[PDB]
Amino acid sequence: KKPPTVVQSRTDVFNEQFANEALHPMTKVIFNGLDVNTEVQPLSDDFKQISDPKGYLTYSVKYEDQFTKKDKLRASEADDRIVGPTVNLFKYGAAVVNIDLNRDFFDTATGIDLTKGIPLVQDLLVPIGVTAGAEQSAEYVSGLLMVLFKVMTDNRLVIVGETTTPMSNTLSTVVNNVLRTTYHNNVGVNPALLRDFTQVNWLNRDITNMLQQAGTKYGLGLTETRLDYVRLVKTIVGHALNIDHFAASVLNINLRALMEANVTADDRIKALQAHSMISTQFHGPNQGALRPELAFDHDHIIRCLMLAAANYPRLEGIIVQINTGYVASANVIRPVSEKRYFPENLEQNQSAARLVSAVKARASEADISSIHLAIAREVSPMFNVHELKKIAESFEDPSSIVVVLEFILFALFFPTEFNRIKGDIQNVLLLFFSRWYPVEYGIFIQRGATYTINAAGEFEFSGRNEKWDQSLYLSEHFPALFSDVPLAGANTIIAIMRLFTPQGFLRTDDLAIAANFPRASRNPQTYIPYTNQRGTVTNEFASRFRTIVATLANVVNERAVQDDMQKATRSCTKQWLRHLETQFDNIAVAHTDHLSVVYATMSNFMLNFTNNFSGNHATFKPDQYVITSPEGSYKPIIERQGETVDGLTIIDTSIVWPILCQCTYPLVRQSIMEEIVYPDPSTTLSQSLSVAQVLSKLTLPDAFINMILSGGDSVVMRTYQTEADDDLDEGIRMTTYDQYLSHIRERLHITNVPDPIYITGASTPDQIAASVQATHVAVVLYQSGVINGSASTYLRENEVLVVMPDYYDVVSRFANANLQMNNNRYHESVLEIADIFDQADFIQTSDAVRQLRALMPTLSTSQIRHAIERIAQITDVDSTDYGKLTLRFLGTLTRSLKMQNAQIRRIRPDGTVLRYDDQIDIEAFRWSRYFLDELRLRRLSVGLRLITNPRIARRFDGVRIMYLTDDDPDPDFVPDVPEGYVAVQYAHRLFSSSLANKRNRVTYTHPPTGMAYPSPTGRPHVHMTINERAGMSKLVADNIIASVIKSNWVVDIHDIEYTAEVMTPSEGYTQHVDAESIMTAPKGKLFHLQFMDGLLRPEPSAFDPPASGEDMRLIYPLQPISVARSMRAIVNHNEVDRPRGAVAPSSYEMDTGTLSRNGDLLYSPVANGQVGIPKLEVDHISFSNVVSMMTANIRTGDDMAVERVNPDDVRAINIRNA
């Protein structure tokens, strides 16, 4: 390579040993403004800032090609921007008008295909174990998941785009009563603008009839103007757009939570004071309420950081690397190549040759990558359990007291990292005491080598001489040397363990709570190792080491004279023990003045979210949270698995020998002044936001499918009937105890209810009602005895689930007075968990999600895995230039954890999952709200009203085969079953091959008569109902469709799926559907039937010679087709005033109404003194709404500029109390 010219490298060692000082900062000019040095990024990249909003539902028109005219209609020049694109979409000749999902919002980038009318996503939920072409029907059920997913993640926030203001004398008076003084250039399309502009007379009459009612009042444009309180400029205007109320409700939730958060851009200063030095100052710029911002979400970030520690245990390497980057950027400890482990004329002394082999064998070289790592491990959270670097000592000589002095200095410099490995230090120290104090060692062992904490606060010592392992750190056993309980006879061992006590204080996170940062406790309190020591002659931290060595020089003296070693070999020990006295006085000025303001400001970072230490080694344990789940195993947060970050778990206690001796500090040298480097906030702020932005959207498809399937779990019950004339559901509902133990009992420890009562036969129904009113699920437990006839009347009426231990003679447990209940009279049916449980954010029991689970196929724990990997393929998350460095660091595995009804609970150190406690855990752990944001539950409730809308539910099931003529075509015509038919359920027992007339024929047997009907000609009038269509022969299906044409049967097939597009008579039928595929197809094939609206057919001339053929029609629907129809046949008939069956638009489509103070949309009031009906209560669809949009004077989420002022002296910064 290079290596340069060893003369030039000999002056390299001379250069880096004798460094100097430069860089005077004075310039120094008058500035009559605000001297901005740094900029601040926004705390939450949350909102997009689109200008013209696109709705969820838009109009769609299929024109009839003959009556229409393909020109653009030309109104007046001022009206063509308002009325123009409406009359060009509802142009004269519109056959049908359908209301469907918007294609350029639910575009091809989200994988939703809206070509066939319904949403269809390809490979989200595919049923397994079916025929290879039977997955098409399940795409609708997985299509509505992605439509619900896009509404939920719709973070748009409308800014006023390119509006225009017309003159009032340029618009006609039929528009000038409508237009509210301005309008966007993209006005959209809405049939209320068709008033006095459309050619069609009955449509112009029906819209004039509706807009003159009291029930509606259509407007367009500016309604509200929230002028600001101080600057007097307009901030939030409400424009009455032309947009549907499912998209206008989401756009108002994004504004009602941005402007009514009342946290400005100046609260980013609170997030800088945490990520900078203590008692620094930030000035200006006072941007006020014209620069709003979301509050930093405390409940969500601390909820995802408990998944991110469980799924990704390499997260400890992220937070330490961010904390190491703050230590190395402070220039806090700088190594040098000059050793001073020994005083002058002691290393070459022959007496201490046994001593200098014990200090130079422990003191490693001063590598800066590990001293900075040792500081940063302290305030960091612990995820992998730290274990000790193995120290092999036998404690033979009195010069082996160095190893104990290694542990004293490691207990004072790093008391937090002393606690995490204090047990493996006992494994070394029990070889120390057992070879120096053998009389008092056995007195200590007979009490115990470990102890536990009793519930009554006592110390239950075990009594077993056990070597400690770093597992048992998570269990209830403690190291027994650190109990600080006096023992009679062992007074010396307890006295030396009083030298490992910490010398610090307990500082609350005052700058982190006010910054509203994530914390995993109630009072976030960290342990700073030593108090700032301003203005003292004798340093009160260095004087602690005076009294430690004064005890250790009596321990090493009694060990020396017991084995009558030399006067010289003992004097060289005590000269070395007071050389550690002198070298500690030089650095205790610089630890307790310059480190104690670094450990203070590192305890306020965003990602240092746990308590590290309390102040007592005898009682403290880390709060062991887990991610519990009833349908899986709990994954602990703090969990020893040895998964290193390549040297992060191995704690090296030899780090204190370079810290004590061969490290120069920026306060020891007074004589130059170092001009202490205050690090900038933006390096550790932007590394903490980028991690908290990546993992906030990392379990985002993990959360969505596990929110829909939250109640998808089920139990097995039986329904014992107790009277006559009962159905399958009425009766006493009874399940087994093992079915209760696996599913229902673990969900009662989550919902925090008492145990249900044990009814013993002698239980009145006012006792069972006491358990149902307390435990909110209707579940009681059986114990013994015979339950009286009084309580059987209560369990029948309220459907209370009774839990039995076994199904052994179950009627004998009830006092069956009616004698209708029998051991073989029941209906073994399922019972979903969502049907008996209900909480706010635990089980989604809403009526929208209730329907989708009935449309999903038989799922698995492998298809939920495929549905998560498919959503994360679609939505590639936002990833900054630091976030890509973290995602390929953790980095790949996520599917090891069940997320079914996952909550966050503590555990006992024994291993049992505790309940939620109102006074120990934080309030963000009681209900993990599907691990979602605060906003995206409010967007979700608008999305649930969009899925259960009948206007988009166009997955048509059920089909009818009949042989009527097609002379008046319309999709609404379900053919009526005639008068004298006989309804017959389909079964394979009916059709069979029978020799009839010299030929084997398929023979139908009519079940009311039993007659055999071999030919399909003389078969009776039968209304056959097919429910199965599975295992059906092809020859049988040939006979049935032959029986429809010949013998006029009506065949219903209820178990089919199809879509339907309403054609026009000029376009005609493009593609047909055969009757072979309508019978012999797999269960999940999604058909596409085309129906023709024969209302706009060309009426034939009166002198036309007639044609020959007839238009027949074989396949008919069951339910009304075109539920999405708004208007139909927009023409004017020449004989009659309005055409046959042509419909008028509903008045709810034209109603702006007002905007409520909460932010919900309201219709127009029907009378005075009446609050208007909210638009999300009814199932009607409104296409004009008031959307709260911000103006050009807001600028949500830009970089604001501050002034950082460094403090003057690093010794003048107070830490405690404040």
Automatic annotation (TrEMBL):
<dbReference type="Pfam" id="PF21416">
    <property type="entry name" value="VP1-like_C"/>
</dbReference>
<dbReference type="InterPro" id="IPR049422">
    <property type="entry name" value="VP1/VP3_C"/>
</dbReference>
<dbReference type="Pfam" id="PF20855">
    <property type="entry name" value="VP1_protrusion"/>
</dbReference>
<dbReference type="InterPro" id="IPR049421">
    <property type="entry name" value="VP1_protrusion"/>
</dbReference>
<feature type="domain" description="Capsid protein VP1/VP3 C-terminal">
    <location>
        <begin position="1047"/>
        <end position="1187"/>
    </location>
</feature>
<protein>
    <submittedName>
        <fullName>VP1</fullName>
    </submittedName>
</protein>
<feature type="domain" description="Inner capsid protein VP1 small protrusion">
    <location>
        <begin position="713"/>
        <end position="844"/>
    </location>
</feature>
